[PDB]
Amino acid sequence: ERTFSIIKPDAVKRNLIGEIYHRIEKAGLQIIAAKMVHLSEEQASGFYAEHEFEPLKEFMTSGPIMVQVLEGENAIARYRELMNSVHGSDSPASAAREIEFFFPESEICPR
Amino acid sequence: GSMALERTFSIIKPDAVKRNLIGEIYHRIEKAGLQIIAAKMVHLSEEQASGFYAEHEGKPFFEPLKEFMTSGPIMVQVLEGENAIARYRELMGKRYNSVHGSDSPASAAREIEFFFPESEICPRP
Amino acid sequence: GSMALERTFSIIKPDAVKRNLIGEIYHRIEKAGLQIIAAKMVHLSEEQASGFYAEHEGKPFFEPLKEFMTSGPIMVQVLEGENAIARYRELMGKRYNSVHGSDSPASAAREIEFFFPESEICPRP
Amino acid sequence: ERTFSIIKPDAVKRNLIGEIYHRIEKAGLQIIAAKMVHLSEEQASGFYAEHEFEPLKEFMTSGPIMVQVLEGENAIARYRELMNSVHGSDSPASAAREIEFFFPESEICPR
Incomplete structure (x- = not known):
């Protein structure tokens, strides 16, 4: 069971x-x-297309x-309880x- | 606006990645x-590790x-900062280290x- | 002399103030x-921002x-007018918006x- | 260099x-x-005391x-040229x- 994460630009800039x-x-x-990307207008729109x-x-x-990407025994629950400032998946799928x-x-x- | 700006390369070897x-x-x-x-996480191969360390064939x-x-x-x-070459070299101290770093600008x-x-x-x- | 008179609160966040x-x-x-x-222009502090948003501690x-x-x-x-709560809410559309507005009289x-x-x-x- | 401004009640009332x-x-x-104040008789007299x-x-x-209060590179001159209906400082000090x-x-x- 693997989850997803995004470090927002506030934490990246503040080191x-x-x-x-x-x-x-x-x-x-x-x-x-893992990798460091700088999102564009079309990139951020696609990942957040469930709003518009x-x-x-x-x-x-x-x-x-x-x-x-994070891996571990029951990560979606372990990740959400660990942590806005940081992104994390709410449910599997x-x-x-x-x-x-x-x-x-x-x-x-x-x- | 200092001109001491420079970038250095860094690798976290698999022993430290496996140990988290x-x-x-x-x-x-x-x-x-x-x-x-x-930054990015990659898994090297025989073909890729030979190209990077090609100076030691x-x-x-x-x-x-x-x-x-x-x-x-x-x-x-890629680590950036004022005198990043020497600052990062001083962090690890100075072949099979816990971490990798550049020793010169070239x-x-x-x-x-x-x-x-x-x-x-x-x-x- | 309508009784639909009501007042609503509004904040222009620093991103819009800095951008003029x-x-x-x-x-x-x-x-x-x-x-x-x-209306007035203020610069909040750790103590003042904690009191306003105290419902989210x-x-x-x-x-x-x-x-x-x-x-x-x-x-x-403080914006005043007939049905100012809904009229101002409709202006911005509906946490980190470009502007702030009250959602209810209380x-x-x-x-x-x-x-x-x-x-x-x-x-x- | 900062200047001063007053929006007269004609423009405030007319939105x-x-x-x-x-x-x-x-x-x-x-x-x-900036702030919105309703001047009194003593308030308006003090700000306009150079008449009496x-x-x-x-x-x-x-x-x-x-x-x-307005800020900017050379505001007293830039403000006076922009604009009675509105107040503005004539000279520094x-x-x-x-x-x-x-x-x-x-x-x-x-x-």
């Missing part, structure tokens, strides 16, 4: 990537895929973000749509 | 003034060095262009 | 029949919500008394 | 606050302090006004006396 990652790896999850909103697109494109939006299988690295 | 130390290493880098402007330790960097996923980043330029195209480097502003 | 959109937002409010009977998004409303000066106003009463005393409300006649 | 503010922010100035007149006090107290009459430093918000 908080290590704290967010360290608070997870100590909780049991494992970063099995405008002020949210401007903030998510105001700087680079840290996208990552919602993580599958968000993971496939940013990650092909060739970019996912099982341990 | 990615966050602990990132925190030590960020706490030293450096900033991650480009004739050495009798190539076949294992290639075999260590392909035993698990790694984490490669080495940093050649090693960044191997893993990251310019379209994957994200300026902070 | 105060006049553009005022014009859209005035062109919809509403009138500004009380346990939520994990409090610390940043407090940090956004204190990153720059804001503009707080919310408008509690939010006006936090920023404006009665001695700062100016009736139009 | 012209947005037009006056929009015509300024598009000109380069920035509203760094009577019909002017009655008009400036016949309704609420919009006081504001005349804005300092008018700003201090309505605004303590605790009410002025630099960006």
Whole structure:
């Protein structure tokens, strides 16, 4: 069971990537895929297409973000209880749509 | 607007990724003034590890060095900041270390262009 | 002499104040029949932003919500008119919006008394 | 260099606050302090004490006004050329006396 995560530009700009990652790896999850992308207007619209909103697109494109896929025994529940400032999948099959939006299988690295 | 701005390359070897130390290493880098402007997790292969470490083909330790960097996923980043070459080198102290870092600007330029195209480097502003 | 008279509270968040959109937002409010009977520009603090949004202390998004409303000066106003609650809500469409507005009379009463005393409300006649 | 401004009760009553503010922010100035006050007989007399007149006090107290402080590179000249119906400082040190009459430093918000 794998979940999805997004580090908003507030934490990336304030240099908080290590704290967010360290608070997870100590909780049991494992970063099995990650990359830093700077979303565009069309990119942020596609991931947030279930709204159609405008002020949210401007903030998510105001700087680079840290996208990552997390693995672990029961992650959707463990992740949501760990943590706005950070994104996280609410239910399964919602993580599958968000993971496939940013990650092909060739970019996912099982341990 | 200092001209001491420079970027350095960094790799978190599979032993630290398998042990889940990615966050602990990132925190030590960020706490030293450096900033991650480009990063991704990749799993090297025989073909890719041979190209990066191609300067050590004739050495009798190539076949294992290639075999260590392909035993698990790694984490490669581009660290930016004032005197980032020396600052990041001082963080780890100075072949099979816990982390990788560039030792010179020409080495940093050649090693960044191997893993990251310019379209994957994200300026902070 | 309609009894549909009511007042609503409004905040222009620092992103719109820093971008110099105060006049553009005022014009859209005035062109919809509403009138500004009380207004002032303040710069919130950790202590003041915590009191206004005190209903969201346990939520994990409090610390940043407090940090956004204190990153720059804001503009707080009292808009008056017939059905001003729904008219102003319809202007913006319906947490981190371009502008703030009351959603109910009890919310408008509690939010006006936090920023404006009665001695700062100016009736139009 | 900051200047001073007063929106007379004619524009406030006619709902012209947005037009006056929009015509300024598009000109380069920035509203760094503002509040709506209803002047009294003693208030209007103090701000207009350099006369001592009577019909002017009655008009400036016949309704609420919009006081504001404006900031920008060379504002006294830029403001006077933008614009009776609206007040504005004529020279520097005349804005300092008018700003201090309505605004303590605790009410002025630099960006």
